[PDB]
Amino acid sequence: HLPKPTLWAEPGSVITQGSPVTLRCQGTQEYRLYREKKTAPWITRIPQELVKKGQFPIPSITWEHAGRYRCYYGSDTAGRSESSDPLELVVTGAYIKPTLSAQPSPVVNSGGNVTLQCDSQVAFDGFILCKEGEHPQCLNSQPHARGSSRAIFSVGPVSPSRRWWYRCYAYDSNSPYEWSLPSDLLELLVLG
């Protein structure tokens, strides 16, 4: 037991509240999953039959599941691996959904850049723009690009052969792993 194992989530690490997700660790059988800063009791309730296979399913995720997780195998007694890279499990749907629009239009010419605006009716110190992959690439708004209840993002160059699907979220930095309901899906339509 030496090499740090791999920790991941299926279908992904950004899950809508109430939906299922399975955290998985792979390195032989003595897997140990844990949440940083605050213990996560659900882990202790996973049947050993699944733990031995590095499977930690969450049938219906709740706000309480959100957090930064790591995994390792072995033990102090028998020796243990380094902890895996961190997995930030995010649960969405905690706040009113923001509005995401393309400036000046969702319809853009190939090779161009477009400005996306995520607007909220309630103040939030955090804004995230996620490009729905095909895992989705989620990025925090830049310091220079966010107001008290709004954030701007610049995407591009765009091309017709690639898909441009986005959704944004607002959140409170004191609970960085709990996001708002997602904004309606924004689909950029690249002419050409």
XYZ file of C-alpha atoms in Angstrom:
192
model
C 0.000 0.000 0.000
C 1.846 3.054 -1.316
C 0.587 4.749 -4.532
C -2.247 7.181 -3.843
C -5.527 5.903 -5.274
C -7.854 7.584 -7.761
C -11.064 9.143 -6.434
C -13.937 10.106 -8.721
C -17.713 10.472 -8.948
C -20.295 8.991 -11.313
C -22.011 10.543 -13.113
C -20.101 13.625 -11.967
C -19.199 15.866 -9.018
C -21.933 18.490 -9.517
C -25.222 16.837 -8.566
C -28.720 18.285 -8.303
C -30.174 17.802 -4.821
C -32.139 14.558 -4.575
C -30.264 12.855 -7.427
C -27.912 9.868 -7.051
C -24.133 9.817 -7.346
C -21.497 7.248 -6.475
C -18.062 8.182 -5.192
C -15.444 5.662 -6.225
C -11.890 5.032 -5.107
C -9.403 2.745 -6.829
C -5.836 1.994 -5.861
C -7.188 -3.334 -2.793
C -10.014 -3.547 -0.255
C -9.163 -1.371 2.765
C -10.571 1.820 1.264
C -11.116 4.848 3.484
C -13.122 7.812 2.229
C -13.433 10.976 4.301
C -14.515 14.605 4.071
C -12.114 17.409 4.973
C -12.891 19.868 7.793
C -16.053 18.054 8.918
C -16.668 14.316 9.195
C -19.341 12.824 6.939
C -21.418 10.163 8.780
C -23.016 8.760 5.619
C -19.674 7.178 4.729
C -19.719 5.090 7.922
C -23.116 3.710 6.900
C -21.927 2.195 3.609
C -22.052 -1.632 3.661
C -18.594 -3.193 3.905
C -19.499 -5.206 0.809
C -19.318 -1.964 -1.186
C -16.442 -0.396 0.735
C -14.267 -3.383 -0.167
C -14.897 -2.558 -3.813
C -14.198 1.121 -3.310
C -17.842 1.979 -3.968
C -19.613 4.655 -1.917
C -23.083 5.281 -3.387
C -25.375 8.144 -2.416
C -28.891 7.185 -3.628
C -30.271 10.696 -3.085
C -27.808 13.497 -2.359
C -28.562 16.157 0.269
C -26.934 19.490 1.205
C -25.187 17.644 4.029
C -23.259 15.488 1.516
C -21.558 18.492 -0.080
C -17.880 18.829 0.700
C -14.273 18.240 -0.244
C -13.430 14.533 -0.136
C -10.251 12.457 -0.266
C -9.582 8.720 -0.198
C -6.749 6.401 0.787
C -6.413 2.678 1.503
C -4.757 0.619 4.210
C -4.385 1.777 7.802
C -1.991 3.088 10.424
C -1.397 -0.508 11.546
C -0.791 -2.155 8.176
C 0.492 0.951 6.434
C -1.533 3.343 4.289
C -1.242 5.209 0.981
C -1.090 8.982 0.553
C -4.556 10.494 0.227
C -5.966 10.887 -3.293
C -6.386 14.241 -5.004
C -9.407 16.090 -3.529
C -12.918 15.649 -4.919
C -15.221 18.609 -4.491
C -18.727 17.185 -4.317
C -21.205 19.935 -5.130
C -24.961 19.833 -4.524
C -27.122 22.273 -6.496
C -30.576 23.782 -6.015
C -30.147 25.667 -2.733
C -30.954 29.145 -4.070
C -33.131 30.904 -6.634
C -31.803 30.236 -10.111
C -29.928 33.059 -11.825
C -30.470 34.239 -15.399
C -27.764 33.506 -17.986
C -27.742 35.399 -21.270
C -25.339 35.993 -24.149
C -24.260 39.576 -24.865
C -25.265 40.878 -27.307
C -26.689 37.655 -28.748
C -26.615 33.835 -28.415
C -26.288 33.795 -32.208
C -22.648 34.443 -33.091
C -20.361 34.170 -36.108
C -17.625 31.550 -36.197
C -14.303 32.614 -34.707
C -15.920 35.252 -32.533
C -16.013 35.773 -28.776
C -19.139 36.367 -26.713
C -19.833 37.825 -23.284
C -22.060 35.790 -20.976
C -23.946 37.404 -18.115
C -25.143 35.545 -15.005
C -27.700 37.708 -13.194
C -29.256 37.092 -9.775
C -32.040 38.926 -7.946
C -30.312 38.214 -4.636
C -26.769 39.145 -3.669
C -24.213 36.336 -3.693
C -20.457 36.613 -3.364
C -19.887 33.678 -5.699
C -20.655 32.991 -9.362
C -19.826 29.916 -11.428
C -20.071 29.295 -15.163
C -20.109 25.648 -16.217
C -19.648 24.524 -19.800
C -21.737 21.366 -20.104
C -19.240 18.897 -21.524
C -19.985 16.512 -24.385
C -17.443 16.191 -17.307
C -18.531 19.859 -17.220
C -15.839 22.516 -16.838
C -16.953 24.865 -14.076
C -15.076 28.140 -13.481
C -15.361 30.869 -10.855
C -16.038 34.369 -12.117
C -12.973 36.623 -12.252
C -12.595 39.264 -9.494
C -12.731 42.054 -12.074
C -15.842 40.546 -13.643
C -18.314 40.335 -10.764
C -20.723 42.636 -8.983
C -22.734 42.009 -5.815
C -25.458 40.123 -7.675
C -24.007 39.628 -11.156
C -21.001 38.187 -12.977
C -19.673 38.309 -16.531
C -17.646 35.699 -18.424
C -15.935 35.785 -21.799
C -15.941 32.647 -23.958
C -14.456 31.936 -27.365
C -13.185 31.779 -30.034
C -16.279 29.788 -30.968
C -16.743 27.389 -33.891
C -19.772 25.539 -35.376
C -18.116 22.123 -35.039
C -17.997 22.434 -31.241
C -20.946 22.473 -28.837
C -21.387 25.537 -26.634
C -23.743 24.690 -23.764
C -23.624 26.686 -20.521
C -25.392 27.013 -17.181
C -24.376 29.292 -14.336
C -24.775 29.202 -10.593
C -24.674 31.652 -7.723
C -23.418 30.665 -4.280
C -22.357 31.846 -0.823
C -18.606 31.443 -0.221
C -19.282 30.338 3.376
C -20.796 27.161 1.865
C -18.808 26.885 -1.400
C -20.104 23.386 -2.170
C -23.796 24.309 -2.141
C -24.943 26.068 -5.319
C -28.164 27.632 -6.538
C -30.591 25.940 -8.876
C -28.879 26.030 -12.275
C -29.808 28.780 -14.716
C -31.715 27.613 -17.782
C -29.385 26.026 -20.340
C -27.751 28.590 -22.633
C -26.910 27.292 -26.082
C -24.685 29.383 -28.303
C -25.622 29.000 -31.956
C -22.549 29.534 -34.123
C -23.482 30.393 -37.701
C -21.450 28.826 -40.487
